[model samples]
Target: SMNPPPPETSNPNKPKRQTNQLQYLLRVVLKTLWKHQFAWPFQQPVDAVKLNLPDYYKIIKTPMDMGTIKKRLENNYYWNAQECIQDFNTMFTNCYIYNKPGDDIVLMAEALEKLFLQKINELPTEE
Candidate 1:
């Protein structure tokens, strides 16, 4: 017969543990978004001069991207998932504002938005 390991005694504080769990789950969601086919254009900050869209910054004051969001998540900048989701929303909204309806970029933004919403819905509800 083999001896069993002793049971652990100390437990982490509930609130901190819950927050960490949420962070880990959100990380998985972010990873999925990063791998999305429509993610390329939204991964990094837009180069206005290189893209020849001089007024891009003027139009969208707060430009959000996946790369920035990833950094924030890794840094624990978000207190909850809603904050991270808002950044994603900002990214999609900026794309819609800058691009014409039915444009390829706009279509890609729509697809990514749908996927993000679906993934968020799959997360466990907080009590």
Candidate 2:
């Protein structure tokens, strides 16, 4: 049999590398979230919740699709403990620890938010 062609590759030298950076950052977020992957054998795989790869990617690039996520970031307010617990109840019953891919994207954006906020706070303001 003939050897199969190697998988296609993207141009590593693309003009704009920001999207590539986004993809790398997104993958880092996902692998960090799947904390329990080590406990089980790699063959059978764990729950889709643990590795909903497609969903995670979607959320990162398309936060507009998730109403709750969009609203929280817009309103500049996260849910209270009670609200979070309620959300968690619904989430646990029908979702994964990380839930949607958009969630991951939101998280990554939030991380940037914190950093920028820190940078601003560190800057000296004249009286």
CA-lDDT, candidates in order: 0.75, 0.31
Give the top-scoring candidate (lDDT): 1
Candidate 2 local lDDT, 1-127, one digit each (tens): 2222322223334332223223322233222322333312211212335554555333322111122322322332332322222321332223233455457544543444344344334333322
- For model 1, residues 1-127, the per-residue Cα lDDT tens digits are 2222222223343232336435644577788889998899898888776677778877877788888787766655666777677888999999999889999999999999998878887776664
Lowest summed lDDT across 10 adjacent residues in model 1 is found at: 1-10
Model 1 vs. true fold: TM: 0.79
Give the C-alpha lDDT of model 2.
0.31
Quote the lDDT for 71 in model 2.
30
